[PDB]
Structure formats: structure tokens, C-alpha cells
Structure 1
Amino acid sequence: ADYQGKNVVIIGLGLTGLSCVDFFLARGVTPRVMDTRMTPPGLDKLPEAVERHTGSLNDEWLMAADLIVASPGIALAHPSLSAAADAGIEIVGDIELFCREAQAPIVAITGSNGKSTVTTLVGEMAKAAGVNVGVGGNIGLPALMLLDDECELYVLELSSFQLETTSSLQAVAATILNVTEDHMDRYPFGLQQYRAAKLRIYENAKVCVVNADDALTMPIRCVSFGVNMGDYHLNHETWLRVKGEKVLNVKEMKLSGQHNYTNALAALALADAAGLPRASSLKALTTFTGLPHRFEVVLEHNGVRWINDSKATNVGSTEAALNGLHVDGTLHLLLGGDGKSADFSPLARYLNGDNVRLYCFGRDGAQLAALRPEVAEQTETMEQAMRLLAPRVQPGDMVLLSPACASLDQFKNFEQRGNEFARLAKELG
């Protein structure tokens, strides 16, 4: 698009907002930027010339705007933003701005769990084929920072928040990996509203890739992946298959776990649709080792594995860690933080038996301990929980941080939570 001479207002002085400020300045447009936080993190990095407003949204600025660029961390339902929308003021996000500018095909990936793994895998598959690939989005690198005339393929992890404000995405291949309750603090019309945000990813996608085992991933035809069903499916040793043909024995993969094998199927389906050679795509599957904070063994010592799964910020993710988990002794499970109004009940079925202890902390600690009080301890912080469990740990035990919650009540982000866990594990283990 052409933004020359438009009154542009950006909401958010985080990573996204700073990238948008630069995007507009490079195009001869000086935006104004606001943030409801009194002392937002990006204040220091904001150029001196750019007007900024903190501590609230500025309605004088909003209602004067020709274009509002809303960071994914502000709800469109915010009264100030809904007022602007009612006035017919255009509201977009950074992913929208990116789509308007991108000059290479985009693979777009969302879902309640697995989306960083699949995004990274597709990136690895592209690299294995010698394709100049830009990987970013919700995974951490703001999409506008990917824009590159030499880029041949973009792979974007997209949150439901980012999808709400995106209207111009025409993916070469798009997927919703799964939909499980998350972000209910942002979705007062519940699961179907959350789902509706994710379903936007399929609009004008060349190929849609759905989860045959999760009907909420389906639009209302798509390529499918699944365990026993799907164009891409598993054949049990376990094999990855594409329509009945064996393509990879998963003993060649570094990743393990059935949910990671279906993640590999999703990645391969997207890579196939994007036109990458299957051979090099399969190669990438055999080399990829995983992501930080995603069921990451940070210490294995004295017959105990200490596993950082801080990236488990919802119940579905912690289920993926627990479902089929083999532990030789006792599982010491750390749960807690901001549960975002989730129902934690689905976890209860994994918490039976003589060999599970729960250490619950943060905002929703009490609600988590309530899953099975008789084997639960509640503390205020994760450090207190660690120092509590550590003396009790015996050879053969597992210590698992898979907290089923956001970290943001006590931590900067889930990476900080994971780093602190790994530090404490190395101290106490």
C-alpha cells in the first residue's frame, strides 16, 4: 500500500511496535505511538523524533488517525479501539502490513500447540533445499524485520491475536495445527471466538492443511494430516506416510512423541504445498533437535532428568508432555503462573498414582494444587517450589516444568521462566 501523508498511530511499544515505527519512518511517514503501560519496555529504543504517549490509550490520537496499527497485545475489543472501528478508522496489525509488502510465498502456521516446532521445521526444510527463507512472526522475530528482496519463502508463526487484525494474507499453504482452550482472557465469547480468529488463516490460502483428528481445525477441500487418518498419517516402530506410502521411519528423527510425529507430518504437508523437494524436506526432519524451553532436558545427573517445558503455557501443551510420559521413579511436576481463566481439569487424569508430586505456584497456584490436593504443595514462586522439591528428588525421578500457564504474572516471558528453572536445576541437581 501507499501510506504517504497518512496520520498513522501505532499501539504498542514492544517488539512489534518498534518494528512498525521503523517500517513507517523508512517510507517517509512519521507515526505516533502509544502504549497503556506506564513504562513500556521499548521506550528507550524509540527514536527521539517520534511522538509517544504512555500510561493509557490516547483517544485524541486514535480518533484523528487515518490508520491504526495495533500490536497483538491489545484487544480489538478495547473500548477506545472499538470506538475507532465504529468511526470507520482502518485498524491493521504488523502481519497485515507485512502481507501487503511481501514478494515471496508465505507459509502460515497457527494452533494452540506445536506451531513453533512446525514453523521451525518448515524453515529447516527450506534451508535444506537451498532456499533463501525468512522465518518469524509470533515465534519471536517481528515479520516486518524479515522483509528482504532476496527472500524466496517466508514462514510465519501466527497467533490468534495477529490473525484477528490480518485481512490480506494469501498463504501458499496454511494450517491450524489444533485448537484447545487458551487465551480465554482475550476471548469473552469463548472457544468458538478463539477458533474464529484462527480460521482466518485459511482465507485465500492456496492449500489449507487441517488436522484430521481435530475438527475445530477445519474450515467448513483441505489436505489433512493425522495419526490413523489423513493424507499424511502415521503407520505403526512408527512411520511417516503420505497416502499409504512410507516416507520416513521416525527412528531417523531426533524429536520423539506422537504429537511431534504429527508435527512432522504437518511440516511435510506445508513444505510439499510450498513446492519444496520432499527429499531435502525429509533430511531436515532427521537433523532438527528441537527448541529451547520445549520439553528440553537441561540437566541429567544422578539418575534424574530435569526438563524445561516452560513453553507449555496452556493445558493442551502440558497434556502433550504428560500423555504417555515414562518416569522410572516419581514425577515432580511444577505447575503455575497465570492460567488465563483455563479449566485445568483435563490434567487431572494424568495425576493419579503413588508416583506423582505437584508443586504449584504463581497467580493460579491454589487452583492447580486443587487438582489433587493430597499430593500437592503450593508456594508463591517457582524458586520456592524448586528448593522445596529438590531435597525430595531420588535417582530415577523426573523434575518437569510444564506449567500449563503464562509466565507473565511473575516473569518477563516463558524464556525467562525456563532460564531460571535451568539455573536452579543446575544448582540443586
Structure 2
Amino acid sequence: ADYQGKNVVIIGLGLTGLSCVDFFLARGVTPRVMDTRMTPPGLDKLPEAVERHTGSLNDEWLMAADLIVASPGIALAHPSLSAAADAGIEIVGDIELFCREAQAPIVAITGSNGKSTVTTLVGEMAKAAGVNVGVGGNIGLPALMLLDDECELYVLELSSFQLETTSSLQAVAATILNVTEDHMDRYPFGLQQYRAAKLRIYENAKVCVVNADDALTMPIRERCVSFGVNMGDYHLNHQETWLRVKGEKVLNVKEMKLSGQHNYTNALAALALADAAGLPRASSLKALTTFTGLPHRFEVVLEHNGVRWINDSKATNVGSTEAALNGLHVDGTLHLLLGGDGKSADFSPLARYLNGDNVRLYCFGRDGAQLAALRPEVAEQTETMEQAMRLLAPRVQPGDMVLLSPACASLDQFKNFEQRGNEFARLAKELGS
């Protein structure tokens, strides 16, 4: 596309907003930036000759623009954006600018849980095949920083928010791994509106890959390739567990470093997408056996003195926490940390995992009191995650697990879930020796 001489406004700084700034400048266009935060996260990192407005949206700037580039962190439904949409002013995001320039195929991945693990996995499968691959998007680097004429494949994690402002994506392979309640603070029309945003990823996709076990991942109306536990074009076989494609065994999971059923369906989805992208199967399977997991994803930061302390800080929703608790083996007592910005989620689904004598809850952050309510007799509420740790530490016994899998965003008290996971790791180290 050609942006020469246009009035461009970028809404939202940070890494992404910064990457969009660089994108326009390198193309000979000086945009202007605005952010509803008085002091946004990359402000002092921004070039001097770029006009910026902070502390609110600027309607004068918006209503004058030829193109608005909106961070995924601002709602399209925001009154200033809606007004500019009503006036016919074109609104895109960073993924859209990226898709209009990219000169390699894209694998596109979204879903409420598993999306970064699959994205990473498909990226390692291309690396194992000697393919020059750029991996990023909603994980790692912002898409626009991957753009390179030499790249042979892109693998992108895409959030529901990124998908709302993207229209030119034509993925070689796209998946929605699953859809469970999340971001309800951004979706006033509920779960169906949240799903609808994710369904945008299948539009003009060469192959679509659905989860046979989750109907919501399927288009509204050829067919998609599927993965699943007992069913699907890609599926599990329990003699010991194998991954199979159409009845053929391709890998015995004991060769994987990851474990758990939900990692095995991640592996299936990753394979299916690599297959659709033309990558050789042998090297794809080799990558499955070398991948050790992402940090903050059910990560054992300390196993010592009979106690395992797990950083599952990436659990930012109810679905992810269920994944950790469902089938979880604990010898003695589980000390479960819950807390932060629940985004108006229904926590009920968690209740059925919190019975029996061998469970303790330490609830903190904005929605702490709501998380304790799940079973108040076994629950403590603190303000912070630090205070919670210092409160559970003394009670920890050989055989126990300490599990940070909070079911909420960290953004009420932290920069991001990585900072929360790193703080937990530091404290677990202090308190656990």
C-alpha cells in the first residue's frame, strides 16, 4: 500500500505503537501518536520530531486523520474511535500494516489458551527444517519488526483484539485453538462477540485447522483440518500416548519434553499447521522432541526440600488455570495463588477442582475477594502477591506444591505477566530454601 502524504494517527505507544512509528518514518511519513495514559510505556523512547498527545484521546487529531492505527489495547468501541469510524475514516492495526507488506506465507494462530506454545512450536519446526522464519506478533517481537525480504515464513500469534482491526490476512494455515471466557471487559456482547473476532482469522486462509473438541473454533458456515483427543484428522492414541495423523502413528509422546494432554493437543495443532505450510514432517517431529516449554508456562522455578514451586503466571484466564488443575497430581497440599484483574470473568468453573482437604487458596490484587469466595474456609486474601507468598511459605510441607496460576491479568499491579512470574520466581527462591 502507499501512505505517501497521508495524515496518520497511531493510538497507543508501547512496543507496538513504537514499531508502527518506525514503520511510517522509514517510509517517509511522520505520524502523530496519542495515548489515554499520561505517561505511556515507551514515551521517552519515542523520536523527538513526532508530535504526541497524552492523557486522553485527541478528537481534533482523530477527525483530521486519513488513517488511524489503533493499538490492540484500545477498544474500537471507544466513543472517539466509533465517531471516526462513522465519518468514514480508515482504521487499521499493526498486523494489518504487516499483512499488506509481507512477502512470505503466514501461519496465524489464536485461541484463549495454548497460542504462544503452538506459535513457538511451529517456529522451531521451521528452524529444524533450515527455513529462515520470523516468529512474533502478540508474543515476542511485534510483527512489524519481523519484516524482512529474506524471511521465508512468518509465524504469528494473534489476539482477538489484533484480529478485529485486520482485513488483509490470507494465512497459508490458520487456527483457533479454543475459545473460553476471556477479555469480557472488552466484549459487552459476550462470548459470541469474543469468538466472532477470533473467527476473522479463517477468512481467506488457505487451510483452516479447527479443534474437533471445541465447536466454537469452527467456522459459522473445503472443510477444515481438525485436531482432537479421540477424534480429528490429527489425534491422540492411548496405549502410553501417541500422536497420530489419520490412524498413522507419527510420535510417541515420551520423546517430548513437554507433558500433559493439553500440550499433546498443542503438538497436534502445531503439526497440522506445519504440514499445511509445506514443512517436512521429519524435522517437524524432531522439533517436538527438543522444545522445553516457554517460561511462565507451568514452569518449575524451584524443586527443593520436597516442594515444587510452579510459575504458571501465563495463566491469565479461567481456561488456563483449569488446564493446570485438571488432572494435577499433588502428594501433599496445593497452595494455589489466585489474583489480579479478572476482567469480569466467571470464576465458578474453578470451584470443582478446589474440594477435599489438600487445597489452600491465597487470593490477591483487584479481584482477590471474589477469588477467595470460591471456597472461603480454605482461603486467605492479601493485597499483594508478595504478601501471599510470605503468608503461605511457613505452611509449606514436604510433598506440597506452590502453584501461581492466577486466572487473571497482572496489569493492576504489574507491567505484564512476565514481571509477575519473575517476582514469583525470586520470592520462591528466597522463601523456599
- TM-score after normalising by structure 1: 1.00
Deviation at 1:144, TM superposition (A): 0.2
Q: Note the alpha carbon deviations across 1:209-262, whole angstroms, 9 max, x for none.
A: 000000000002100000001000000000000000000000000000000000
Q: Note the alpha carbon deviations across 1:362-391, whole angstroms, 9 max, x for none.
A: 101100000011100111100000000000
Partner of residue 226 from structure 1, selected from 219, 224, 228: 228
> Which secondary structure does the structure 1 equivalent of 2:34 belong to?
strand
Give the Cα–Cα distance (whole angstroms) in 2 for the partners of residues 43 and 258 of structure 1.
Answer: 43
> Which secondary structure does the structure 2 equivalent of 1:101 belong to?
coil
> Which secondary structure does the structure 2 equivalent of 1:74 belong to?
coil
Q: Note the alpha carbon deviations across 1:370-427, whole angstroms, 9 max, x for none.
A: 0011100111100000000000000000000000000001111100000000000000
Deviation at 1:303, TM superposition (A): 0.6
Deviation at 1:324, TM superposition (A): 0.3
- Please tell me whether residue 381 in structure 1 is matched to residue 384 in structure 2: yes
Deviation at 1:325, TM superposition (A): 0.3
Deviation at 1:301, TM superposition (A): 0.4
Give the Cα–Cα distance (whole angstroms) in 1 for the partners of residues 184 and 123 of structure 2.
Answer: 30
> Which secondary structure does the structure 2 equivalent of 1:354 belong to?
coil
Q: Which runs of 5+ in 1 are unaligned?
A: none
Deviation at 1:123, TM superposition (A): 0.1
Q: Which runs of 5+ in 2 are unaligned?
A: none
Give the Cα–Cα distance (whole angstroms) in 1 for the partners of residues 330 and 397 of structure 2.
Answer: 12
* 2:247 corresponding residue in structure 1: 244
* 1:58 corresponding residue in structure 2: 58
- TM-score after normalising by structure 2: 0.99
Give the Cα–Cα distance (whole angstroms) in 2 for the partners of residues 142 and 339 of structure 1.
Answer: 25
Give the Cα–Cα distance (whole angstroms) in 2 for the partners of residues 38 and 377 of structure 1.
Answer: 35
Q: Note the alpha carbon deviations across 1:63-117, whole angstroms, 9 max, x for none.
A: 0000000010000000000000000000000000000000000000000000000
% identical equivalent positions: 100
Give the Cα–Cα distance (whole angstroms) in 1 for the partners of residues 112 and 17 of structure 2.
Answer: 24
Deviation at 1:157, TM superposition (A): 0.1
* 2:304 corresponding residue in structure 1: 301
Q: Note the alpha carbon deviations across 1:141-162, whole angstroms, 9 max, x for none.
A: 1000000010000000000000
Give the Cα–Cα distance (whole angstroms) in 2 for the partners of residues 428 and 38 of structure 1.
Answer: 37
Q: Note the alpha carbon deviations across 1:290-331, whole angstroms, 9 max, x for none.
A: 001000000000010000000000000000000000000000
Q: Note the alpha carbon deviations across 1:148-202, whole angstroms, 9 max, x for none.
A: 0100000000000000000000000000000000000000001000000000000
> Which secondary structure does the structure 1 equivalent of 2:185 belong to?
helix
> Which secondary structure does the structure 2 equivalent of 1:41 belong to?
coil
Give the Cα–Cα distance (whole angstroms) in 2 for the partners of residues 51 and 384 of structure 1.
Answer: 42
> Which secondary structure does the structure 2 equivalent of 1:185 belong to?
coil
> Which secondary structure does the structure 1 equivalent of 2:324 belong to?
helix
Give the Cα–Cα distance (whole angstroms) in 1 for the partners of residues 194 and 292 of structure 2.
Answer: 31
Give the Cα–Cα distance (whole angstroms) in 1 for the partners of residues 41 and 235 of structure 2.
Answer: 44
Deviation at 1:279, TM superposition (A): 0.4
Deviation at 1:140, TM superposition (A): 2.9
Partner of residue 270 from structure 1, selected from 273, 298, 305: 273
Give the Cα–Cα distance (whole angstroms) in 2 for the partners of residues 295 and 223 of structure 1.
Answer: 29
Give the Cα–Cα distance (whole angstroms) in 1 for the partners of residues 381 and 39 of structure 2.
Answer: 31
Give the Cα–Cα distance (whole angstroms) in 1 for the partners of residues 226 and 82 of structure 2.
Answer: 37
Give the Cα–Cα distance (whole angstroms) in 1 for the partners of residues 84 and 210 of structure 2.
Answer: 35
> Which secondary structure does the structure 1 equivalent of 2:188 belong to?
coil
Deviation at 1:128, TM superposition (A): 0.2
Deviation at 1:13, TM superposition (A): 1.1
Runs of 4+ in structure 1 off by over 6 angstroms are none
> Which secondary structure does the structure 2 equivalent of 1:186 belong to?
coil
- Alpha-carbon RMSD: 0.4
Q: Note the alpha carbon deviations across 1:341-371, whole angstroms, 9 max, x for none.
A: 0000000000000000000001011000000
Give the Cα–Cα distance (whole angstroms) in 2 for the partners of residues 304 and 62 of structure 1.
Answer: 55
Paired residues, what number? Answer: 429
Give the Cα–Cα distance (whole angstroms) in 2 for the partners of residues 204 and 189 of structure 1.
Answer: 25
> Which secondary structure does the structure 2 equivalent of 1:83 belong to?
helix
Deviation at 1:41, TM superposition (A): 1.4
Give the Cα–Cα distance (whole angstroms) in 1 for the partners of residues 416 and 121 of structure 2.
Answer: 23
* 1:255 corresponding residue in structure 2: 258
